Amino acid sequence: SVLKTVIYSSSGALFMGVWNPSSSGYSDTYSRRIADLVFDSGIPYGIDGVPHPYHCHVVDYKSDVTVPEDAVIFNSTTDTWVAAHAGETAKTYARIECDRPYFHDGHKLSAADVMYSLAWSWEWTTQDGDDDPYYDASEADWSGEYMNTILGIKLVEQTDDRMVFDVYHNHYFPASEIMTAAYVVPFTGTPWQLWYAMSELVAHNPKYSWSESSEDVEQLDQINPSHAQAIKEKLLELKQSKPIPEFLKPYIEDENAATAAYDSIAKFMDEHNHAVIGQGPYYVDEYQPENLFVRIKKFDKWTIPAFAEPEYQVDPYYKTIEVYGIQNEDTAILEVANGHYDILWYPFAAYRFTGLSDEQRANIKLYRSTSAFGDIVWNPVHDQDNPYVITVGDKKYFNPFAVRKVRFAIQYMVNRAYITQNIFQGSAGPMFTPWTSTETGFEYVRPVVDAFGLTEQSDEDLAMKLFEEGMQEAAQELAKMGYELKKGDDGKWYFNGEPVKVVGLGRVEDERKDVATYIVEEVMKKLGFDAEAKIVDRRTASGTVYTSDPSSYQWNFYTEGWVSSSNVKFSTTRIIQYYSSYWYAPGLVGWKWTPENTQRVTMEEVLKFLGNGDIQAGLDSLGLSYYNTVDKIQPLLNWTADDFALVIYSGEANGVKMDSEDKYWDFNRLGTAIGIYEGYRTFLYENWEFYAASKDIEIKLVDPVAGLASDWAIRSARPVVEHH
Ligand code: NA
Numbered sequence: 001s002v003l004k005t006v007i008y009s010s011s012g013a014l015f016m017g018v019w020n021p022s023s024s025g026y027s028d029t030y031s032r033r034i035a036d037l038v039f040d041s042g043i044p045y046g047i048d049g050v051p052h053p054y055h056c057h058v059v060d061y062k063s064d065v066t067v068p069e070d071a072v073i074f075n076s077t078t079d080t081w082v083a084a085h086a087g088e089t090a091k092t093y094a095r096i097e098c099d100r101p102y103f104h105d106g107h108k109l110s111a112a113d114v115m116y117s118l119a120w121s122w123e124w125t126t127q128d129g130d131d132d133p134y135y136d137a138s139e140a141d142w143s144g145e146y147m148n149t150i151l152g153i154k155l156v157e158q159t160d161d162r163m164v165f166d167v168y169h170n171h172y173f174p175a176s177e178i179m180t181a182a183y184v185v186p187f188t189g190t191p192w193q194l195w196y197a198m199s200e201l202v203a204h205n206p207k208y209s210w211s212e213s214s215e216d217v218e219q220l221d222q223i224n225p226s227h228a229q230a231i232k233e234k235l236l237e238l239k240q241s242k243p244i245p246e247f248l249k250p251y252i253e254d255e256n257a258a259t260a261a262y263d264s265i266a267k268f269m270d271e272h273n274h275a276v277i278g279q280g281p282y283y284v285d286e287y288q289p290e291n292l293f294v295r296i297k298k299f300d301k302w303t304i305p306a307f308a309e310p311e312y313q314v315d316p317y318y319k320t321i322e323v324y325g326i327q328n329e330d331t332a333i334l335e336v337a338n339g340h341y342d343i344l345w346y347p348f349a350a351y352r353f354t355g356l357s358d359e360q361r362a363n364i365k366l367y368r369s370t371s372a373f374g375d376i377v378w379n380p381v382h383d384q385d386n387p388y389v390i391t392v393g394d395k396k397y398f399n400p401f402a403v404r405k406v407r408f409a410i411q412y413m414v415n416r417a418y419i420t421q422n423i424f425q426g427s428a429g430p431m432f433t434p435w436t437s438t439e440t441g442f443e444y445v446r447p448v449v450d451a452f453g454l455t456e457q458s459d460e461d462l463a464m465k466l467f468e469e470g471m472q473e474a475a476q477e478l479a480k481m482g483y484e485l486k487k488g489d490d491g492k493w494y495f496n497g498e499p500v501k502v503v504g505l506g507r508v509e510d511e512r513k514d515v516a517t518y519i520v521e522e523v524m525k526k527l528g529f530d531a532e533a534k535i536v537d538r539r540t541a542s543g544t545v546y547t548s549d550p551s552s553y554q555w556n557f558y559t560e561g562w563v564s565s566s567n568v569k570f571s572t573t574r575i576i577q578y579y580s581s582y583w584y585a586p587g588l589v590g591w592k593w594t595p596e597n598t599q600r601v602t603m604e605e606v607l608k609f610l611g612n613g614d615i616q617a618g619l620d621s622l623g624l625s626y627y628n629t630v631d632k633i634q635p636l637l638n639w640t641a642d643d644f645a646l647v648i649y650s651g652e653a654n655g656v657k658m659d660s661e662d663k664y665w666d667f668n669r670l671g672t673a674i675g676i677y678e679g680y681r682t683f684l685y686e687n688w689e690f691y692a693a694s695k696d697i698e699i700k701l702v703d704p705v706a707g708l709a710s711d712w713a714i715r716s717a718r719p720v721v722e723h724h
């Protein structure tokens with residue numbers, strides 16, 4: 001049985017990210033779609049938007065429990081397990097039971113794989129001395145605060161088919177017990193021996209990075225055949241010199257079996273020309289980058305995970321799944337409509353599904369996608385000693401988007417109705433924050449949008465008034481430092497006698513090229529800048545914006561697209577992902593908009609703007625449930641989006657606890673009010689798109705907002721049986 005699938009590709013690239021188990025791995029929807037069939041989560045999100053038991057389930061949950069002396073964390077200075085938090089109160093205790101699937105090379109997953117995974121996170125998030133080679137600045141930003149909430153873990157028991165763990169942590173999510181009890185999932189998708197080899201390769205070979213790509217640095221990629229060769233060499237070196245790391249010896253049943261797994265892993269890598277080993281239902285059989293082609297095959301040792309509920313007890317039918325990269329949308333659609341491929345595994349706008357015959361339409365079924373959206377990210381980079389200037393070698397540039405009021409003005413300059421009705425031909429809706437109109441939170445953060453008077457039509461008078469104030473303030477501060485910023489008689493801005501230049505990146509694959517053109521011609525040029533749209537593909541955009549330092553100043557804005565692969569009832573990541581300095585700020589690598597690097601908007605400043613000087617009037621504008629008085633807001637007045645990000649994501653920040661649902665929603669509202677005012681991202685639109693699949697395929701589990709991007713769809717796909 002063969003399933004033929006299409007992923008929309010660029011001319012040269014199927015993937016926009018890399019296959020690696022760090023937090024910098026699987027950044028993109030293209031790799032993640034495939035990876036979510038190769039790897040199983042312990043407690044995955046379901047199509048209803050909450051976590052569900054699968055490989056793992058919660059056996060016991062209590063709050064406010066003493067951490068015992070046999071619950072450990074990994075100390076990265078000594079590389080030893082220490083009960084560093086014994087005697088503290090843990091907000092959360094959870095006993096979690098796991099099954100033990102087989103990895104794709106053939107050996108069974110064990111508690112050593114789980115403990116390696118956690119040690120790796122504790123190790124690579126901390127710089128243990130100024131020259132620690134086992135450190136990644138991106139990983140620290142991604143995961144550091146998460147790892148700080150973990151007070152201790154204990155292996156209670158391991159049998160041939162079960163693992164039991166006691167977990168102690170400080171996360172309490174007030175609207176969901178399972179999100180509280182399963183905040184730390186004692187499970188992993190990668191065999192420790194392979195991860196050990198990758199860690200040793202990245203630590204000691206400057207050519208390889210978990211997170212970074214540049215001229216002499218490649219971000220580690222398990223599907224890259226060349227990367228796989230380097231990983232295999234390191235793996236076979238470690239098998240001889242140090243097969244079992246000291247810290248893992250307490251967690252290994254059998255040192256001979258652990259040593260033999262090195263050979264099992266190497267033999268798989270030899271057969272398949274890659275390093276991708278998971279414990280999911282499909283193994284990666286072959287990658288042909290020159291053909292934009294992937295083959296994955298059903299793993300004959302995979303079984304329905306022990307704790308799957310009935311809806312998720314699906315046994316993936318298809319023995320082989322072929323993935324074809326196709327670079328033209330119309331061609332992709334016609335190939336599925338004419339029956340040459342089974343699933344169009346990337347969604348397109350309604351207007352692309354036009355012109356099909358009654359027969360072509362009868363041959364397909366459509367599944368909605370309403371979980372994708374688009375925004376502009378600005379590069380606000382500047383020198384430590386100068387808020388408005390960036391030094392690149394011998395040249396100094398004025399960065400207009402380092403001025404808060406310039407970024408804020410653009411919220412009102414853009415005409416989102418024009419973008420949605422013209423560029424997306426009516427197949428998108430105006431969007432102002434990171435919640436789409438098909439998410440639970442939409443009406444909870446809407447009052448923030450109304451507090452700012454934001455509409456689908458532009459307000460160019462307000463935007464021009466804010467822009468001109470921002471530039472006047474900038475020109476005056478720069479004058480005191482000996483720099484001249486002046487509007488010429490030609491209506492253009494000059495900095496030290498030269499035109500202010502900005503470069504916008506759009507995307508060759510889709511309507512984002514037209515978004516970039518719109519921003520360059522109808523915003524940048526209208527504000528008096530020399531502006532240019534550079535149109536690039538996935539790989540270039542990823543490498544320029546996300547995996548290299550924005551200090552190079554080689555882009556000023558980028559047309560971002562984001563997609564959820566799952567329905568999510570309660571997001572804990574919107575503020576940290578989009579507004580905070582922790583994650584994409586603007587990219588994952590090098591300079592970010594941290595309070596150490598740049599001045600950051602505070603809650604008080606936004607409340608004063610929204611209330612025309614009166615704090616209470618500002619709070620009233622935001623529809624708050626708990627933090628709705630001057631007296632209650634007092635401890636939050638100096639918070640930045642980073643504080644809101646952290647209290648939502650980790651459960652606590654600066655001693656303030658997220659201990660009610662009212663507070664969760666207020667933190668999102670207040671976080672979003674800062675995010676709009678600060679204007680590092682200008683949200684534009686939510687996309688309304690469609691997946692297509694053969695009428696002869698039944699898909700039982702369809703995510704109502706993510707459609708076929710959810711691995712539950714292809715896990716649940718099977719031939720129609722009919723005798724009509
Ligand atoms: Na370290």
Ligand code: NA
Pocket residue numbers: 201202203204205206207208209
């Ligand atoms: Na390195």
